[PDB]
Structures are given as C-alpha cells and as structure tokens.
Amino acid sequence: IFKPEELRQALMPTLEALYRQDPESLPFRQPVDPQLLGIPDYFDIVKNPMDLSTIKRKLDTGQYQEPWQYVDDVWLMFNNAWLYNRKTSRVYKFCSKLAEVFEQEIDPVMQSLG
Numbered sequence: 782i783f784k785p786e787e788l789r790q791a792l793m794p795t796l797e798a799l800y801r802q803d804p805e806s807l808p809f810r811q812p813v814d815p816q817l818l819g820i821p822d823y824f825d826i827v828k829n830p831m832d833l834s835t836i837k838r839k840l841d842t843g844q845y846q847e848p849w850q851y852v853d854d855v856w857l858m859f860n861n862a863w864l865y866n867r868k869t870s871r872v873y874k875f876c877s878k879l880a881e882v883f884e885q886e887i888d889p890v891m892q893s894l895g
C-alpha cells in the first residue's frame with residue numbers, strides 16, 4: 782500500500798539510529814552465526830532470526846509493504862536476543878539499550894506515515 786521508496790526514506794533514519802549505537806549495536810550488525818559462536822541450540826530457540834543487516838536489506842530491496850512489518854522485524858530482533866541470552870550478558874543489556882533508542886525514534890515516524 783506504501784511505495785518502497787517512501788518507506789525507505791521515512792524508516793531508514795530509525796535504523797541508522799540503531800547502527801550509531803556503540804558498543805550496543807555491534808553484535809546486531811550481522812546475523813547470529815551459531816557455527817562461529819559454537820551454539821548449536823540457537824536455531825532451536827530462535828525460529829525466526831533477525832538482525833540489523835537483514836532489516837536494512839529488506840528496506841533496500843522493497844520487501845516491506847507497510848511500516849508495521851518493519852517495526853515487527855525490529856522487535857523480533859529484540860525479542861530473539863532477550864529470549865536466548867541471559868540477563869547478565871552484554872547482548873541482553875545492549876539489546877535493552879537499542880530498544881530504548883528505537884522507541885524514541887520510531888515514535889514520530891509512525892505518526893507521520895499514518
């Protein structure tokens with residue numbers, strides 16, 4: 782219902798705001814690799830992986846038809862990390878910071894799109 786360029790122009794700054802977060806975004810900039818990490822149970826627990834680079838690609842390639850699909854992918858990323866990692870880990874606390882940032886950025890944008 783939305784043109785892919787309008788979605789990208791409006792939404793990409795909110796993704797850029799996540800990428801700008803250092804150290805917090807670094808573990809989220811590429812898909813979780815259970816082979817490199819030695820965690821063969823990762824895809825048992827996380828059935829639908831998501832990360833910043835995959836969200837960026839879906840914006841870049843026109844895979845979102847409406848902006849709540851983008852918001853849902855961002856929250857899928859967050860919920861995957863909170864689900865798999867322990868609350869004392871960097872990834873878990875880093876994820877919480879990304880959620881704080883995203884909440885503030887996505888707010889005016891979703892209003893502007895609808």
Ligand SMILES: CO[C@H]1CC[C@@H](n2c([C@@H]3CCCC(=O)N3c3ccc4c(c3)OCCO4)nc3cc(-c4c(C)noc4C)ccc32)CC1
Nearest residue numbers: 804805807808809813814818820823861862865866871872
């Ligand atoms: C810049 O490419 C690298 C980024 C980080 C690396 N990676 C590591 C490493 C494994 C070595 C031992 C260590 O200590 N790692 C580490 C952990 C956190 C870091 C960090 C390094 O450096 C950047 C800031 O935070 N574990 C990770 C866990 C996840 C993850 C998420 C999200 N959901 O579920 C899981 C499980 C994702 C990436 C991970 C992988 C390539």
